Amino acid sequence: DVYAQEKQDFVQHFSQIVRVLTEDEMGHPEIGDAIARLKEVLEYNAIGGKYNRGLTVVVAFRELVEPRKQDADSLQRAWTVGWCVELLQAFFLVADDIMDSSLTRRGQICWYQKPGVGLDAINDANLLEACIYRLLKLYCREQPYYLNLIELFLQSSYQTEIGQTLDLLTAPQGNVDLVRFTEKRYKSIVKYKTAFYSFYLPIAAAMYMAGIDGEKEHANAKKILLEMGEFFQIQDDYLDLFGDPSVTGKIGTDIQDNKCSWLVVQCLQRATPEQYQILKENYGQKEAEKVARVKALYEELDLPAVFLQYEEDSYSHIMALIEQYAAPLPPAVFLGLARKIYK
Amino acid sequence: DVYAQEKQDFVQHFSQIVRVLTEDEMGHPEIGDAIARLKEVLEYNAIGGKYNRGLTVVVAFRELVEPRKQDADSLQRAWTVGWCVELLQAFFLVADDIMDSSLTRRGQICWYQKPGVGLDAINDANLLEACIYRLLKLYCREQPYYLNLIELFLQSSYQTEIGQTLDLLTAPQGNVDLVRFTEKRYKSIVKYKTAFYSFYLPIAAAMYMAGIDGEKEHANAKKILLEMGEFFQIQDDYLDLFGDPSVTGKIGTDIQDNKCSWLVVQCLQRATPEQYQILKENYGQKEAEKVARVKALYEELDLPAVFLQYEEDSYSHIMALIEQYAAPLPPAVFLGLARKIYK
Numbered sequence A, B: 001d002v003y004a005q006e007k008q009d010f011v012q013h014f015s016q017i018v019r020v021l022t023e024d025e026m027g028h029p030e031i032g033d034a035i036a037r038l039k040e041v042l043e044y045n046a047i048g049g050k051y052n053r054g055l056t057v058v059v060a061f062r063e064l065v066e067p068r069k070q071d072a073d074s075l076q077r078a079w080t081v082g083w084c085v086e087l088l089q090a091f092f093l094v095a096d097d098i099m100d101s102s103l104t105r106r107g108q109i110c111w112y113q114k115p116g117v118g119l120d121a122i123n124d125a126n127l128l129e130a131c132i133y134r135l136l137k138l139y140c141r142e143q144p145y146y147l148n149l150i151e152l153f154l155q156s157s158y159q160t161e162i163g164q165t166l167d168l169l170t171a172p173q174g175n176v177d178l179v180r181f182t183e184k185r186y187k188s189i190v191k192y193k194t195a196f197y198s199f200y201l202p203i204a205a206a207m208y209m210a211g212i213d214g215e216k217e218h219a220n221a222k223k224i225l226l227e228m229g230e231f232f233q234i235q236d237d238y239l240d241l242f243g244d245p246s247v248t249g250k251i252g253t254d255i256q257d258n259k260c261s262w263l264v265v266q267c268l269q270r271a272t273p274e275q276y277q278i279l280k281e282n283y284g285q286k287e288a289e290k291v292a293r294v295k296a297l298y299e300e301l302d303l304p305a306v307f308l309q310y311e312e313d314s315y316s317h318i319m320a321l322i323e324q325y326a327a328p329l330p331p332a333v334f335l336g337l338a339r340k341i342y343k
């Protein structure tokens, strides 16, 4: 896979990123201890994921830029910007795990739950975010797309934070009000909180590094990418319950967490006064017996069939979007993402 | 005062800032509820302080720019950038109050302690930070100092976060180890965590808006400003204990909070094996009787006299620094700050 082969040079470049970010201590030994803390925060939270977002920057870069213009320095910058996307990701996860009181992440203990960390992780999360801009300055300061990348990253943070606000207001920890779990709210949350930084950002970054800064080109890529993000989250919600932990590599808990899942949203549109009550009395409960009661209602409403029907329509629509908005970009850029996301 | 008269037009401009930041909802009603939350976060956390940092941007701007170049739009931008400094301040305070479990701030209940907020304040704090860059883009996008201000603000956040890291590592909530309360550590913490964004940032911003972007000019202003910041914190620590709540407008708790105060740092350099024990057995305790025991030790070591002697030397040094590094800037810029800080 384009990601499998490149993943090696990606994860290997992290060592250099850490070195560069923790080398401003050579001239300021006074902050030495802080810099050492920063290194630990970086190694624990930026490593261990799949790097889908970061690698996307590298893969797209190689398809938008001519093979000869891909010199050592240009690729070095691509890997760096890819790692910037991963730090943004690390920033969000550390903060998010705190806000929803999670216990584990990527299998390991959430950073803030580690002995001696606690709420100090709030400052660690902000440092991760800050590192993004330090890397951009250190590697792209002289590039014509410098300001474009800074604003793209700042914009992605704002969008994601607005989305998190929406998500917090929608599922308040202490209010099992399924009334606000509408389809419009769900789509808005996905769009701002996940789609923008997970799919648009990586592609948009590569585009700017390739010299493609056209407002229309970015607008068309966004049209396609935000739709892929929407399908990504919907499939992710579906797999959380009906997926196989052996394959997916994770155990679903959206039901016990009272999450505003696509499943519950659909279940709310396809439910009778009596079916709704069962849902309103078994959603957000730790009892395995109550959770299974929700899964039963879902199948009873043939949601798995609804998802399948949605996956088919979504695939058709995406291919249509690619056929209409891909140009002047290589369709393979978007097709490669689709193939990764769709099954 | 230059601040008293200008403060009116400053606090009045906040209404416009809120309007502009909460008007992107006119075209995206989907995030309406999030935008309403943002407005509430802004009005509660950016208002109520003294606005010393923000006003400094406005006052300095009027002294670095010619009276005729101060048109309606230029002043509008100065007020906006001044409000950006205040949002950065609001971002830090909201986060800091959470990390150290504070109960009140500026007399009122800390935002996160408000019913229905809690840890969600972590995302609110990040939104405040994000607003800075939205304002800069909305008001200075076309200005030649645009990128300079973005980087200055990004750099101020990084510096302050590194300083907070240092401060967290120095006084861990659960380790009354006075061994790490050294003078070098104290000065490093003050410099990164407070001096850079509180004194350098405001002046540096006005400088760039005035067209003064010289690396040497900024380096000289920093030399002076960081020294003023150092004196500011030291005087603030001294007043926390020996100050009069009626005048200062706040009750000291550094002793009960086990803070790495300038006082304790001095007390640690001027203490005998027996005096140290008393300190090590009465610092960080809520008991009013133990706190008074610390204050007694301080006076016993004539710290108030030490502070007075330090204020005199600091004043002389600052005036020397101003006489040597002020140019080509108007000395009144720095003199005005000194007069505000020194008594």
Ligand SMILES: Cc1c(CC(=O)O)sc2ccc(Cl)cc12
Residues within 6 Å of the ligand: A308, A311, A312, A315, A342, A343
């Ligand atoms: C993504 C996709 C297809 C494209 C492919 O061959 O990979 S055929 C098909 C049928 C059902 C569903 Cl649910 C998805 C797909």
Ligand SMILES: Cc1c(CC(=O)O)sc2ccc(Cl)cc12
Residues within 6 Å of the ligand: A050, A051, A052, A053, A056, A198, A199, A336, A337, A338, A340, A341
């Ligand atoms: C599966 C996936 C994401 C979800 C994640 O890995 O956390 S972000 C992203 C971006 C591009 C591609 Cl191709 C896949 C993905």
Ligand SMILES: Cc1c(CC(=O)O)sc2ccc(Cl)cc12
Residues within 6 Å of the ligand: B308, B311, B312, B315, B342, B343
């Ligand atoms: C700041 C300052 C002076 C300058 C002034 O007149 O305001 S004279 C003086 C004496 C003692 C101390 Cl502690 C400070 C000062």
Ligand SMILES: Cc1c(CC(=O)O)sc2ccc(Cl)cc12
Residues within 6 Å of the ligand: B050, B051, B052, B053, B056, B198, B199, B336, B337, B338, B340, B341
């Ligand atoms: C007293 C003071 C600060 C402390 C605070 O108001 O929180 S930041 C600052 C910047 C410039 C001037 Cl002139 C004074 C101050």
